[PDB]
């Protein structure tokens, strides 16, 4: 009941995202996720 | 075996230069193709120098 006596209340930080621009990583990321490899992996 | 003794000061004539200009190119350019063409090149250039300097130091 006692934390209405505060003077540095704020409410949240409802700030909007920062923006980001697109780098050249993620395509690499994709590239090497495509092929192949020596191992097997699974087997049913 | 005699001209193959030096030019192994030819090579690393070029070496860093060659990376120098790597490095310019892969700054300045503004493509992802070229991008990571640059980068994987920059990656082979320090592998193959590092194992052509300790091949060196290893035979004399």
């Known amino acids: ?44 | 075996n005699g001209k193959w003794r030096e030019q192994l000061g030819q090579k690393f004539e070029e070496i860093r230069w060659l990376i120098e200009e790597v490095r310019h190119r892969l700054k300045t350019t503004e493509n992802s193709f070229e991008q990571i063409t640059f980068m994987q090149a920059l990656q082979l250039l320090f592998e193959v120098e590092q194992e052509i300097r300790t091949f060196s130091f290893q035979l004399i």
């Open chain 1, 1 to 44: 009941d006692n934390c209405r006596d505060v003077s540095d209340l704020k409410q949240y930080d409802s700030d909007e995202p920062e923006l980001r621009s697109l780098s050249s990583w993620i395509q690499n990321e994709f590239n090497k996720a495509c092929e192949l490899t020596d191992s097997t992996w699974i087997e049913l």
